[PDB]
Amino acid sequence: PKNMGKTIKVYEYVPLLDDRNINDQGIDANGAHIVNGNLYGSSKDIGTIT
């Protein structure tokens, strides 16, 4: 639309379990704050998700 700058931008909502959604809100299954907020952030591993 006119009178509305010269730029269009949208919002992309990323899934929880990917790697792109790194944040600081993380408490593991024991109760200790961890660096990664996403549980098994698309590791596709066995040991990591275990």
Add this chain to the structure above:
Amino acid sequence: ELKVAFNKDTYVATVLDASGSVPSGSVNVGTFFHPDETYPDSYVIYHGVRELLYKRSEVDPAQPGFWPENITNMQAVTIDNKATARLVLNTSLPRVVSTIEGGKVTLSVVALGGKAPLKYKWEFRAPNASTWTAVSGQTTANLVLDNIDADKAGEYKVTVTDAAGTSVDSTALVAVGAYPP
């Protein structure tokens, strides 16, 4: 001044005394008066640990913190007390005793606190005065007044002091009818 420690792994809040040694793993989180200075018979040790972990941090229970990130889940912590039990008076002196001149009035106090040398004290206020006068000699619990005269009337106050600093007192007013000589 009860000193509290806290290990973040086992979630054990060891309430040590002022001269304790923090356990390997725990870290100093603060200090509080277990016999609260202002309201002495309203809060318990739990009511002092909660006020100490609210100002702490889940990330590391060593740095201070507040509401969004603090140790407020008061179900995982297990208070492990190693502080001497408060000096309490199990049996205090009677409010009033009243005999006649010549009778035998005995007063007894039982204390259950924490110390090896539980020393005692005794004072005496005449019923017109303002300052307490030291009762010389009697320094061991039961105080016996035999052949009590009229001049030995007023208010007696024991003072059970433990080893370091704690003291608890209790009074007992004594009356003696004096028949004419």
